[PDB]
């Protein structure tokens, strides 16, 4: 029950609407609280500040891909590349179909400044990205151990090349959706990225 | 013409950069730049109507340093369009790593500028600019295909979107975590990796 565990989910939903409408920079807890139907104190009970909320939205994105990620990263996975290809297809699908994922991504890329007032936001991002980076490198190592991608493949650099590509593609669809048939052509887009990892000599040390 | 005005504009723009960088585009009024640049408010209004007008000016300063190579790389009469495109991206990354002004505007563009219904002109311009850039990379690519620099069957369109995506994300990665990408030392590698995808990826063909 009680007071309400699910109040925490109600506050997050309102934080999404507020951030999407006014942007993170100019949203205050008061705004969010009025929007949720609660008091600032009810927000303070779940979050110590605005950075914590942003954090929660960020963190929510990882859930849906949890299993597919852990799969690719694991040593005992027979088909590590196959899991990464699967995950990317999910990432792009969730992005195109789920208004929730779209909005949080929109907030993250286009509605969330990095300013000296909440270095917390930029810090959250940095570590979030280094994390994702570590994960990516691990997967690349596994695909190599299994000869799914060329032997002496500079993992670190390919990881960055991957993340960059995917990241910029997401941001591109966000800015101009009707100029990237992301849904229909998911296969191509994902593979374009994947092809780079194996066919590109520049990524080979 | 009056040199007095041309100097005041150059000062508004310099201060906008320093402002937007520290406080961000969202919570920064034009009045704030007036005090920062040491100029009358109405003067900024003479120079720039709304804040979006200024942001636009910052975005613009970026294309100056590359206009030459960009044009060359698009020209149908250009003998080595892929070489041009290569040299251009090299000249983009160098200026990023070396020129603090360029780094700051990109940081503003990527990390300090929100899209809100209040200021929709910022998003519209941002869309306009990327469509501009887009049309650019397509011509260039097509010209490199036409000259057997790339695979004949390449899809210029998608290929352009891919490359831009790759270039845009890398810049951002470096702004967020500079001490990760040795963009200065490995510069040629990063430029090549992107290009390799354009010519080697079978998913980009047809
Ligand atoms: O799913 C995510 N990122 C995708 C799409 O950008 C991708 O970059 C990614 C691929 C593998 C990975 N690894 O399994 O942890 C993490 C992220 C985020 Cl939830 Cl980190
Ligand atoms: O970084 C920039 N442009 C990138 C976009 O990917 C660069 O790759 C580019 C610029 C112009 C261009 N066109 O004019 O030929 C093509 C690519 C500008 Cl914002 Cl300075």
Residue numbers in the entry:
A (entry chain B): 6 to 210
B (entry chain A): 5 to 210
Show sentences the authors wrote.
TtgR is a multidrug binding repressor that negatively controls the transcription of the ttgABC operon as well as its own expression. The DNA binding domain consists of α1–α3 (residues 1–53) while the ligand-binding domain consists of α4–α9 (residues 54–210), with an angle of approximately 80° between the two domains.
The structure of TtgR in complex with chloramphenicol was determined using selenomethionine substituted crystals and multiple-wavelength anomalous diffraction (MAD) methods and all subsequent structures were determined by molecular replacement method using the TtgR/chloramphenicol structure without the ligand as a starting model. The structure of TtgR in complex with chloramphenicol was also determined at 2.7 Å resolution. This binding site is broader, more exposed, and contains less specific interactions. We therefore term this site the general binding site, which most probably contributes to the versatility of TtgR's ligand binding property.
